[PDB]
UniProtKB/Swiss-Prot annotation, chain B:
The chain holds residues 69 to 317 of 317 of the full protein. This is Transcriptional regulator LsrR. Its main location: cytoplasm. The lineage of its organism: Bacteria, Pseudomonadati, Pseudomonadota, Gammaproteobacteria, Enterobacterales. Transcriptional regulator that represses the expression of the lsr operon (lsrACDBFG-tam) in the absence of the quorum-sensing signaling molecule autoinducer 2 (AI-2). It also represses the expression of the lsrRK operon. Acts by binding directly to the lsrA and lsrR promoter regions. In the presence of phosphorylated autoinducer-2 (phospho-AI-2), LsrR is inactivated, leading to the transcription of the genes. Keywords: Activator, Cytoplasm, DNA-binding, Repressor, Transcription, Transcription regulation. One of its GO terms (molecular function) is cis-regulatory region sequence-specific DNA binding.
Amino acid sequence: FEGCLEYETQLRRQFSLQHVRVIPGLADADVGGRLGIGAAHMLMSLLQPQQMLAIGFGEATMNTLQRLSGFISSQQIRLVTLSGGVGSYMTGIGQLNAACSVNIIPAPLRASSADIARTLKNENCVKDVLLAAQAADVAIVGIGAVSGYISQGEQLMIGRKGAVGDILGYFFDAKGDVVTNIKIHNELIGLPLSALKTIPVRVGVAGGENKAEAIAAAMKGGYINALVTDQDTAAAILRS
Amino acid sequence: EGCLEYETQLRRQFSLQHVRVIPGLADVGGRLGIGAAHMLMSLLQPQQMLAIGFGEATMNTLQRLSGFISSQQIRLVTLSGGVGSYMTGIGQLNAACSVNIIPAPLRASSADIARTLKNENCVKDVLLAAQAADVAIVGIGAVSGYISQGEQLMIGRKGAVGDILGYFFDAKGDVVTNIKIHNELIGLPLSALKTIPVRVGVAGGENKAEAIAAAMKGGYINALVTDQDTAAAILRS
């Protein structure tokens, strides 16, 4: 039969990934903390001293930063937020050393209207951070699945419009294309997915079998070109 | 030293609640941080809320207060936008500390944009939290890069002597009313800061005496941490 190493090889070839790690399904520990540890080990090998790491929001990325905090200080890694929201990055940034360089988009995650988001993106202190993010060497993001900032109603319509998952709040369909008649898209302050693709090494950290279709789609769209996930999710991706 | 005597005079002359005057007597700003952290350690009860301004005296203070903030579970909230400008201070706390940050720039490119930003739910929520704080800790600037060299010159021409949180006031302590940066700032205005019951100003340097006196006369702070020479200067203001 087949195990984690074989799932890594298959994922790597099937989605043309640059790096993949697949962690075993059960252990004496919950998946999400173990995803963090694994994403952290992958980033430690990928990042060179003084390089720049763009970070998304969410529990998996915040767990990852925690595990990476020592390497971040020791290796002088500069962190930059991929999205607005400020406070949503504090569980991961809090663990860092005071001398660590962190560049934070000083704006909300989501504006109340598209005109307001467009205004805020043009504010110099925000535009500067958006450019810095797009220029990073490596990115780490979570991946949400349609299976705080979005109402129940919006979530239901996002799904009716064919979204399967999101990165940074931007929703894409089963083929990996951004769903284009979704209003939240034009209201978000951070980097759009088309800009995220500038970053050369884009690591998704995500798991739960429920997320298989979203993770697959994210790779088919090109948004991530490296993956950290778990055994069961990997299997499900491969049959997607 | 003559420190207790300056404390008494300052307290009486400006009707202050608490005052500390540190010896003259070389690392001034470092010792003001110590001073103001000590004052805050005696004022804050467990789980109370501290509103913080930006600048180095305040960020210094925060470093020295960091273990008190953990063990007494002090909740921190930013008085202004800017985010990045608070990071040297908050980086020094651990990750179980509660820190509520205004998610917006310090200054918008126009007053309409400031006003739009202040009405965003996520900004407005933090502004209210800030105004509801138990104690505040701010620096005081003296007219003696969020602002042009050109702007700074016109701000002095308009009769400002000093600022708190980028809000400039004249020698009597009144907010200078024809300065457009005021309507571009995202944070709490000074009139709102005055809701907070204990408002501690931490500032020193003889050149700041006029600004510091004025801040007191306008009621923006009602507690002060400063150094001996500055105290002597304020009192002769």
